[PDB]
């Protein structure tokens, strides 16, 4: 099959073959494992000071003075314990915590490919959160070729149907709920489209827009493809980006994309087919269970066991 390509104005203009990276199986378990390890590698260490609580002079008074045995400053003030005001922590935090995590190169490439394949579904992009109800194709390729004024770049995103997703992002900016607003994280906005470009200047006209991000096709970032560790981002490909995907995967030395497999849609079809159904054979009829009750109560209840009636009813 071929993807469609649209002008910077909205009509159909060209067709390109599907890159083979979209046929990789969908693995929300592998995308979650990689997203977790690589988002831990951006952390800045923190720790308390190594002298904190231990700059004072304090020793135990011992028994015989009607007081508890912790170390005390000259004068008798509690010190040097985690349960004393002003003492050290029981186990102080240290910067030698292992902050980063390792991931193999094979599993890093699987996560990018599985996250890119999720982006080719109009049902997973919708369920990720985006507004794509007025979009020509969800594998959305568009010919722009140079964009410098934000005013022109806003005109394309309208000219196609991604206008409601950026206003979704624009009207959502707010002050966050907790302590985070003292620590340089005061505002929050939702995330919109991702424009992926190869050989054309677009970054100047797209960057200022709320909820927009920029990726040169040779280096695609998994934290951008799966915000929140959820796979299906909406992606606006430039034409030259979309037409170099296979060249990029040919540039990875001794690498082959993983093997395509079937889905639960495909398994549910087979079982309802004459090659599998013709092997079916019914179960025996199942036991029949009543409650206990006294046969001697009535004529009819007793007759169920013995019909003749030699047995007295009561």
């Amino acid at each position: 099959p071929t993807v469609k390509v649209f002008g910077p104005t909205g009509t159909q203009v060209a067709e390109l073959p599907r890159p083979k990276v979209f046929n990789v199986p969908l693995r929300p378990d592998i995308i979650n494992f990689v997203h977790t390890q690589l988002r831990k590698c951006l952390r800045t260490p923190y720790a308390v000071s190594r002298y904190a609580g231990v700059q004072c002079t304090a020793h135990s008074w011992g028994p015989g003075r009607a007081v508890a045995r912790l170390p005390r400053k000259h004068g008798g003030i509690g010190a040097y314990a985690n349960f004393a005001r002003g003492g050290h922590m029981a186990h102080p935090t240290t910067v030698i915590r292992r902050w980063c995590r390792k991931v193999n190169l094979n599993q890093r490439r699987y996560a990018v490919a599985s996250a890119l394949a999720a982006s080719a579904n109009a049902a997973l992009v919708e369920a990720r959160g985006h507004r794509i109800a007025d979009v020509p194709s969800i594998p959305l390729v568009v010919d722009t070729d140079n964009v410098t004024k934000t005013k022109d770049a806003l005109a394309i995103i309208k000219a196609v149907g991604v206008l409601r997703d950026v206003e979704r992002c624009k009207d959502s900016r707010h002050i966050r709920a907790g302590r985070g607003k003292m620590r340089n994280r005061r505002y929050i906005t939702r995330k919109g489209p991702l424009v992926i470009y190869n050989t054309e200047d677009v970054a100047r006209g797209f960057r200022n827009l709320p909820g927009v991000d920029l990726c040169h096709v040779s280096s695609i970032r998994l934290l951008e493809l799966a915000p929140g560790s959820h796979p299906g981002r909406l992606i606006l490909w430039t034409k030259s980006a979309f037409a170099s995907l296979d060249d990029v995967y040919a540039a990875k030395q001794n690498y082959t994309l993983p093997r395509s497999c079937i889905t639960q849609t495909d398994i549910e079809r087979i079982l309802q087919s004459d090659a599998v159904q013709k092997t079916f054979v019914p179960k025996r009829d199942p036991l029949v269970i009543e409650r206990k009750v006294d046969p001697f109560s009535s004529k009819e209840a007793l007759a169920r066991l013995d019909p003749s009636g030699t047995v007295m009813p009561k």
Partner: protein, 59 residues
């Protein structure tokens, strides 16, 4: 008999009439089927389980 005389102080026992046997089965009769305790209420269940031994009804 010799095993039962070992546990005499736990048990009481004797010889039942055909009237005692009948009331117990008709009133307190349940069946073991696949490890389940199943109410015995009609001849359909004694036949299904014991017909190989030529027992077909409650009598």
């Amino acid at each position: 008999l010799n095993a039962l005389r070992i546990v005499d102080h736990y048990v009481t026992y004797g010889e039942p009439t055909v009237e005692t046997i009948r009331n117990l089965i008709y009133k307190r009769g349940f069946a073991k089927v696949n490890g389940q305790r199943i109410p015995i209420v009609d001849n359909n269940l004694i036949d299904e389980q014991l017909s190989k031994h030529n027992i077909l009804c409650a009598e």
